[PDB]
Amino acid sequence: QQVGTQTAENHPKLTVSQCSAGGSCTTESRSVVLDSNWRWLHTTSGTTNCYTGNTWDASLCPDPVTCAQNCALDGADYSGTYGISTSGNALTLKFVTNGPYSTNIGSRVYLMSADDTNYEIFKLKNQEFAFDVDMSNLPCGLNGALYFVEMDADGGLSRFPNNKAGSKYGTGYCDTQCPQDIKFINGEANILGWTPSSSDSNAGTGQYGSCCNEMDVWEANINSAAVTPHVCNVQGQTRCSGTQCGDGDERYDGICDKDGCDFNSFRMGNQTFLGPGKTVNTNSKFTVVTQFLTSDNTTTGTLHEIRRLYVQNGKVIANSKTNIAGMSQFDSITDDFCNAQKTAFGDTNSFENLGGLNVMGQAFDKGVVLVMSVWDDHEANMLWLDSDYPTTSSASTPGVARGTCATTSGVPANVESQNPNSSVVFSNIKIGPIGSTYTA
Numbered sequence: 078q079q080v081g082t083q084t085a086e087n088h089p090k091l092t093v094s095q096c097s098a099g100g101s102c103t104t105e106s107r108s109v110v111l112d113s114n115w116r117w118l119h120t121t122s123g124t125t126n127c128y129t130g131n132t133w134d135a136s137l138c139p140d141p142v143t144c145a146q147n148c149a150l151d152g153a154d155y156s157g158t159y160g161i162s163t164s165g166n167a168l169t170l171k172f173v174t175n176g177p178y179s180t181n182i183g184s185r186v187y188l189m190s191a192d193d194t195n196y197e198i199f200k201l202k203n204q205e206f207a208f209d210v211d212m213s214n215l216p217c218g219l220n221g222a223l224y225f226v227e228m229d230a231d232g233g234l235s236r237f238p239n240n241k242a243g244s245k246y247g248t249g250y251c252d253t254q255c256p257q258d259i260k261f262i263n264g265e266a267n268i269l270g271w272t273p274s275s276s277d278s279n280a281g282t283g284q285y286g287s288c289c290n291e292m293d294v295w296e297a298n299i300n301s302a303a304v305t306p307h308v309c310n311v312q313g314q315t316r317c318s319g320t321q322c323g324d325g326d327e328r329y330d331g332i333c334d335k336d337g338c339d340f341n342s343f344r345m346g347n348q349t350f351l352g353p354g355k356t357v358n359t360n361s362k363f364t365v366v367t368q369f370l371t372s373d374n375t376t377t378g379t380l381h382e383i384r385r386l387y388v389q390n391g392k393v394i395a396n397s398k399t400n401i402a403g404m405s406q407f408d409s410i411t412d413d414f415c416n417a418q419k420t421a422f423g424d425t426n427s428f429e430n431l432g433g434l435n436v437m438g439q440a441f442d443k444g445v446v447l448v449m450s451v452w453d454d455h456e457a458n459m460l461w462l463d464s465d466y467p468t469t470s471s472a473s474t475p476g477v478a479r480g481t482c483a484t485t486s487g488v489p490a491n492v493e494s495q496n497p498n499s500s501v502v503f504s505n506i507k508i509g510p511i512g513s514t515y516t517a
């Protein structure tokens with residue numbers, strides 16, 4: 078894709094903290110950028126759209142390359158059109174925004190580096206990452222997600238000749254779902270076999286997907302939360318086609334682990350731990366701390382364990398323990414946990430098949446980009462996060478119940494119609510050595 082200049086691109090500012098042993102942190106000036114899929118895409122010479130609704134203009138986009146050369150991504154009206162605003166260390170993502178020219182549902186942003194051009198690259202091995210979240214305004218069916226993916230720092234500017242926009246315009250997304258709804262992959266418009274979504278009037282899928290390792294630090298709404306590493310057998314952002322993408326029936330045949338090795342306290346058998354008025358009380362803001370422990374306690378050692386702590390009202394709260402009959406008891410993510418939980422639940426262990434925490438840690442070695450988003454789910458209505466899933470399974474079967482929401486909840490049109498003003502606030506991001514990002 079090309080660069081459009083009708084609208085200047087000014088990334089909303091966001092401060093983050095870099096912390097040291099003892100807990101003193103320095104403030105770093107960073108910013109966020111809107112993902113390219115949300116942007117106005119118009120001809121380089123004018124204002125004619127290359128894509129409208131969920132339909133590409135066939136005469137501007139006769140083929141993937143011509144389309145990438147003819148079509149330009151333009152600057153974004155972050156707050157008034159996309160519902161994205163920041164206030165110091167706080168990022169607010171609104172669910173539904175009505176701009177003067179377009180309505181936008183959900184958003185996805187990446188953290189920029191100090192240069193405000195390339196993404197910030199995080200090296201998470203043997204580090205602790207903390208943030209605060211207020212998801213009191215995120216009901217059933219919503220997901221406010223904070224996570225890392227193995228994107229290129231420049232979003233593909235240097236790898237792909239026909240990507241002339243790059244990370245400044247939020248290009249280069251990938252994750253372990255190998256999404257095929259991404260409009261530009263590898264600097265080419267993803268127009269081959271383009272099929273509009275029937276339920277999402279702004280979306281479609283093309284022949285290719287964009288795949289990479291993904292650490293889901295946080296996927297949650299007021300009801301339930303999950304922390305989930307996912308790995309692939311490829312390194313970095315990789316375009317997939319056919320079986321590689323692991324779409325539909327080929328879910329477990331692809332290059333990436335779609336299910337991941339998840340820890341949702343509710344799913345793991347503690348229904349009183351996280352939620353409205355619970356131990357972690359999601360009616361109010363709290364701190365989420367995530368530790369990426371290596372086997373030798375160095376930044377070069379093998380990733381061995383992902384641990385979780387919460388902090389609310391100044392009190393540290395230990396992670397819940399698993400409570401699945403017949404399964405050994407864990408309170409964190411280890412490869413042993415993943416093996417035990419996949420066995421207990423009868424789920425295919427692609428996480429381990431594709432190299433487990435070792436491979437996750439190798440993605441961390443190379444570096445990953447911070448993503449924050451708010452979304453509803455056209456495929457599964459977020460039931461995998463907050464309800465009984467599959468809905469066709471007995472809710473007494475271990476692993477099926479993930480939260481208290483109704484199996485009829487989370488239909489996008491219903492959630493948009495009923496809770497349009499939903500929002501999530503992510504704030505006070507900190508990274509440092511273990512123990513450095515919060516006060517015990």
Ligand SMILES: *[C@@H]1O[C@H](CO)[C@@H](O[C@@H]2O[C@H](CO)[C@@H](O)[C@H](O)[C@H]2NC(C)=O)[C@H](O)[C@H]1NC(C)=O
Pocket residue numbers: 346347348349350356396397398400
């Ligand atoms: C779920 O996790 C919570 C937090 O660890 C456990 O909370 C305890 O609950 C009992 C029963 O109400 C209380 O008497 C304790 O004071 C709680 N401890 C804390 C630290 O909050 C709870 O037991 C866990 N549930 C299950 C089924 O394992």
Ligand SMILES: O[C@@H]1[C@@H](O)[C@@H](O)OC[C@H]1O
Pocket residue numbers: 305335336337339457461
């Ligand atoms: O990331 C999620 C994955 O863990 C799975 O359970 O299906 C839904 C996905 O969005």
Ligand SMILES: [Mg+2]
Pocket residue numbers: 233234235236237238239240241264
């Ligand atoms: Mg290029």
